[PDB]
Amino acid sequence: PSRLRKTRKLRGHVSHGHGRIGKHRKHPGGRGNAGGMHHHRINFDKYHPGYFGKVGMRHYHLKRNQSFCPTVNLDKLWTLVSEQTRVNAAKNKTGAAPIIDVVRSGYYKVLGKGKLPKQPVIVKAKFFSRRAEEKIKGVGGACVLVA
Amino acid sequence: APSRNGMILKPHFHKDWQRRVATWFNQPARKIRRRKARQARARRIAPRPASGPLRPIVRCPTVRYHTKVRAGRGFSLEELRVAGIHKKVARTIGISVDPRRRNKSTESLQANVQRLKEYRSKLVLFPRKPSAPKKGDSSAEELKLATQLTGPVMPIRNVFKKEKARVITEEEKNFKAFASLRMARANARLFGIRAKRAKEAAEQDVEKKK
RNA sequence: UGUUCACCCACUAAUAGGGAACGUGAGCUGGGUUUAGACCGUCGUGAGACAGGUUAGUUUUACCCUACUGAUGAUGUGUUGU
RNA sequence: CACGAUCCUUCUGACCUUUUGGGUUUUAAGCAGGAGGUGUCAGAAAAGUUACCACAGGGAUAACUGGCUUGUGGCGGCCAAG
RNA sequence: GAAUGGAUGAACGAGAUUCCCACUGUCCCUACCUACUAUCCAGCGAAACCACAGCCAAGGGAACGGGCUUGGCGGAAUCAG
RNA sequence: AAGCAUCGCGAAGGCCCGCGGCGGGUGUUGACGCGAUGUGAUUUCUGCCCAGUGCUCUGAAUGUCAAAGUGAAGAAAUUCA
RNA sequence: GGAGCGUCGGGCCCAUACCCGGCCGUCGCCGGCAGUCGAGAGUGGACGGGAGCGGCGGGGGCGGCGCGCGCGCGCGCCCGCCCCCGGAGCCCCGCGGACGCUACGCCGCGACGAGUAGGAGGGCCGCUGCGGUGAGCCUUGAAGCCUAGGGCGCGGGCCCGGGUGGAGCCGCCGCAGGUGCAGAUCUUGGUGGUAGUAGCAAAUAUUCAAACGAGAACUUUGAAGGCCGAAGUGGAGAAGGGUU
RNA sequence: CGGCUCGCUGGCGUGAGCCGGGCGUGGAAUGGAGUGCCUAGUGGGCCACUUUUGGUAAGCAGAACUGGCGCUGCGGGAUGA
RNA sequence: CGAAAGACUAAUCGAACCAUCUAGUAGCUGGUUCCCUCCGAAGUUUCCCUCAGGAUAGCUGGCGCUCUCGCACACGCAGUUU
């Protein structure tokens, strides 16, 4: 909608909202990210601290699928399974504890955020955090490593 | 000239990009053209599967995909050999055959064999003439279907095995997983130098004798 | 002497001083400054430089308005002349 | 008051990390602190000339006039030692 | 200041100066004459330039106004200059 | 411009062209020639300066001086000679 | 004998300032109104027993919290009632509620209103095209154009009358943009003033008659006077032109 | 006021931090406050009172303070930032 | 190409013309199109091969939110003063 834009209101007015002292000249700064080190220095070093300079190790032929390791927090571990596993348990009276294969639902690591409900679980995962393990043990469960 | 906070961003419009803009007003006509072509091929290959040939079950590479399973390119030669299908002939009955696939694990092999077995069972080989010789199926299984198979022939569904709620033996409770991983990590890390120290120690024991 | 300025001769009553966009280039002139050519000296490795000297080097338009100069005319006085 | 960022280099530091299919060793790359300098000192690597000259602009800026000023120049008083 | 040539030098030069003789309107100091114009008419017929325009004095003003302030004043339409 | 004076070159050469060629110009030429500079007829002269910047001559007697080649240690990249 | 100067009076003169009033807009009001009592608001109403001229016998406070239009009252007759707006008749009405109420509406009180650069809001301002919509308009005359006609709007603008013209065009709700000009020594086209002006002045020169012809300064013929003056204004070619 | 905590500090005590109670207008005058995002234009200025540096001075150059003009008309100062 | 003037090379020469790259780049000139309404600046900061430009603060506008109570029943803030 041109109808709604500004330039429609500016018809008539001479400078077109760019002022008549300094004009709308073509490229007064320098084009683009020119002057990061000279003359636009303040902008770059109070809104992009750390832009300039190297750091860390190069790594030439990086491939992201090697380092693929999505995470799930205990917070919502039971969300992986249908409610009626969590229900048929806190029931049953065998002291069974259902299995939660985390890798099936698309997470490899089981990190430790959150309260787990007092209800035993076997959790199958690729990796665990220390605290995430400890929590499951305290609930009355068992961590299970899987390849 | 930048103004008070933003992403210091680098657009790639410094080459003559407007010379090489590729619009997409085709796409509808394209989709139609593809679908017309597809419908033609189906009509040509009369009772054959429109899909194309039957293709092997295959695991994806890399730790990421790993757990999934795809269609592959074609059945390996070892797989065909086990099924009892001559490699040159398989291509004429609608079995894909690559010969570049190795075959590492027995688990992948047998499942693929099972596939070809299944296919041969549920396939209706028309005889070369209408006057029937061996192999060619009965005129019953022929009249009842000279039908195409819409969609991929014997589709792959990446499937899981349910586990019954166990009880957790005391030993299982006992497992120190996090710790276990860390140890294992360090053993991998240190395996090589440990081995070197052992070799040094053995040399010192032998050197003591002489 | 391009000069302004200066000086000297001569006359004179006196050879006072100034201004007007340092009056006055569609008034002239262009001798001088102040393009391009060239010469000399000094300076510069050099290209080149020189309120240092020298010579050669295109000076456009008015029919508009006004101003001024002259030239017909104008309103009035009934018309016309004296 | 007596001093210097990124990048690069160099030295020092830890039974440190990485050096990519795995392992040993050189090498290299990291991490942290010094040093090698930017005096145009918040930090390009840089000589002239143009009268053969050019372009964008500038009365934000010179070379006239005209304004203000009047030191300087010119002209004129007061006082009165001579 | 010596082939970055010094010094000379007959002949020559649409070259640069100085003086003399002659000659002259260069001048004193201007005048008269001729042709072609300009001038008037018939016919034909452009252009540049143009914010609006077009009398002055002083004032103030971006510090020299046609316009503003205060005064002077102002009379159609035009011709050659 | 004649005149004067320097300089290079005896041809697998001087000077020069050309993207390239067992290419081409001088050259259908050979030092009384070709090429590169200065000065500028004649006359009369043409002083001193080789420190500077140029040019040039000589060269195991010799400081430095690259790539290769030669030796050196190293497991090798290598480093050192 | 100020229309001068210094000191001082009264009186009067007028700014877009100040005061009062109108009207427009903006801002603000926990602003008001989907239908109700109520103006320093400081209650209203069951309902039960006991009773009645009783009451709640509290400050020169000068008073607000209590008093003189009734509480009980006139009627039916000490006892009963003290009744219903489909009817009290109404200044308050709680039974139902605007002429008003497109709630993006309507209404009320205050205050305030310079503005470049710049920002924001609203435009039933305007242009062209699309989805909808107006049982829209139009040869019984569309667009456009013109108008010393009549009006509206603060304004952008708009509507009507008359004329001209001769085929299409508009209102509303949405969407979309190559959407609004005084300038750019702007671009293209057109027209002025200048102006019947400058001008049609290089190389000596024309004159008389007749003819033709609508028409002769200029054509043609004749006569005369002139020039070019064989390095020609003569007679032939080259190149170039291309039918002259 | 009452009590707890301390790895600080220390003859005992400090000092801080925590709980639990007890107490209300604490000079004048004025006004509703607080808070967060996006953000254009601007970054040539000039002038006057008073102060003030350079300069003989300047309608000069340069600072301070406030107010102006710039962005702003209107009455007056004839005329006028 | 030049008996040398930077001369000449199709009215063009201190680097011809024609087309393209090309809408070359411009901190610099010029221009930049309807109405009303409300608010309404700056020429100062530090940094910059910065001084006819940017950056950054400042000054402006817009959007808001959180609370406050003239609904007899207020806390906090100020180009003052005490």
Place this chain on the structure above:
RNA sequence: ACCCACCCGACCCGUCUUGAAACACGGACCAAGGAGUCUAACACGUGCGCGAGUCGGGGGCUCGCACGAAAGCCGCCGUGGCGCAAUGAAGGUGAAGGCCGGCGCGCUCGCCGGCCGAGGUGGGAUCCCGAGGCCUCUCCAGUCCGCCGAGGGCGCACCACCGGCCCGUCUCGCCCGCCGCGCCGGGGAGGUGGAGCACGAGCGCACGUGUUAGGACCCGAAAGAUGGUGAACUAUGCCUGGGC
């Protein structure tokens, strides 16, 4: 609104400028054209849909497309993007705490049972409780309805502060673990770096403003490069003619 008169006011616009009626520039006059666009990327604001998700592409299935190159649908619905987790150069690591009882010497350290479960201070719109009034035509009783409400509470969002947790890093220290007892692995206390957690707020779409990259509001160089055309002028050489 057409013309004319008179009094008062009144300099020509645009523009750069501290300052323009300027002896600053552009502008004779009229018509038509004529300059903030589109794409991409980001940011913040706003509207809508869904919400720990969201998403639509790309593809596919439904038609000869009249309207359709639409519309609809898809275990593709999610490969995948963005989000739901950070922090470290990296190897890696990765957000919980409290309380109670017991057992180890409660050793502000280590291990075993039960309960609560995202901490606390101040301030917080707002809810909640509410002594008490304040009347009712009488003296008391007395449920119902309000109005106000002193006083007390739970306290959103948000802010300030203090604790806590995660990752890096240092300092100090004492214990645990086992298929591999090791230059192994795991913890503790106290500082300190982090674009962290501390009962989620995103994703998609649309519109606006701003900032960029692009011809990038419009017009404007002197230049630079690539590839071609010219010696009909003129410069110089040569060939062949002519002339004095």
Place this chain on the structure above:
RNA sequence: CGCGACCUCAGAUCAGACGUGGCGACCCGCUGAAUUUAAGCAUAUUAGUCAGCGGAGGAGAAGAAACUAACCAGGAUUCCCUCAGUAACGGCGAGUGAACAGGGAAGAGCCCAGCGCCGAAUCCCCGCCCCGCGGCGGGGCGCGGGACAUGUGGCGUACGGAAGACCCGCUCCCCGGCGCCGCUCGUGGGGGGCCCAAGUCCUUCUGAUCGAGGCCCAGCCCGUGGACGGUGUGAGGCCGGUAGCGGCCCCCGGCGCGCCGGGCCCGGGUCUUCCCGGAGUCGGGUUGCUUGGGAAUGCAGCCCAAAGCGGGUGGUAAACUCCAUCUAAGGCUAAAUACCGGCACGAGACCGAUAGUCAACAAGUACCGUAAGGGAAAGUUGAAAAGAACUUUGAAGAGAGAGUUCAAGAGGGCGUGAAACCGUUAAGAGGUAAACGGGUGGGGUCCGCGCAGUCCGCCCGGAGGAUUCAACCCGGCGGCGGGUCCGGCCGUGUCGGCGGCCCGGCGGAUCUUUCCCGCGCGGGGGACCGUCCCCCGACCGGCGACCGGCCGCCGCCGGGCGCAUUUCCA
């Protein structure tokens, strides 16, 4: 000094073939800038980009791993999404910048050299016959030539292959012709041709209607046809068309059957014995360019220059070592993909003659330039030419009458005909250039009036005329509202039926393989849980979700009511 083989080389207007140029949107191979950005600039960037040269095709190129990876592994190329503005490059500044995996579009795989076996078993050209001949082919027959052992053909190529012995099971595939049958998806493939519904019906406007009103149901008729165009305005039905698994006629394609001529004796597994790979190439150094590729991604020149349990790769130089992974130095290959040139079509929220292409027109035209090159302007009478016969003035151009046309106030550059500018006619003014703002006045132009504008509307009182009713009941119809929820339909929350539950389905990582079927898994039952539906009773919100009676009210019609009522009129 002969004649004859071959080898290497010549010449032919020898016989018969091919190549040459164009086009150039897309494609392949070179070559290759500079404006530009970095606020300067040189590396970088612009950019392997414009220009330059070469060569193609309907596509090209690429392509069947000397590949990815490091997994439980994938498996030619190309294309899209994503990876990702990421890893990386970079005066680590400006800026640049991929790949693998994953999901799709498509999908197709092969052949040599060598090593070997087979009497060269092969090829080309002659010449005679039969067929076939507008893409020169088949079959036969020739002591007819040549090519070829310096290696043609069959088998065979890394997925292994060959040759042997016995295990098994059995024998259709191709082409040259000649016929003939079913016309074979936009729903009869392609092309061509010719065809196919319904008003010119009644009135009436008009210059002319395709307009306006009507026509057995918005009117008649057709409608699988109401797209578009044409026709004197606006047309489903006037005409062409449009619709239709409509018709007919030609031709051509493509596939189905028959006959002939040829070719063709073409398997698989199992055990044994043999067989095996492309050199001035890899690899190294190097210099130059190139890349995201960083102690060298790719391509080059030069120098060096290999091996065979080798060689290559395994994204940090090197040595040692294990692993993995391919097999290089020969070749072919459809498909999805590209397409501002071409031929032929379709469409548009585009432009509408200063726009849109330079070009709506006799435009790459006229014209300019020596040449390379530059490069315009320019659409519209009217329905129909009916384009003005004739008279008259004039040498004529030009007029005046006359005429055509609805109109020439449409007259051949003619639709509409703005402004600037000019002529005239009318009105008004005029010594401070004009013009302007505020305020009045004077004059004009038209516009509204009034030949009283006393403007209307209620109600009332009076005096005149006027018809019929209000009021009241009676009969009918319709509407409103109401509660008794009275009776029944209707639905919210709750409870009862466990009743739909199998006669109620989906979903579930809940269970069971006691089940069934197909091969521990898939599909289906069978339990279970969640969710959605029947039966009746009770309570409650009795809800605009409705009916039936009854009530009350309102309205309309029709009866009665004749005049102290009832409206009308002045």
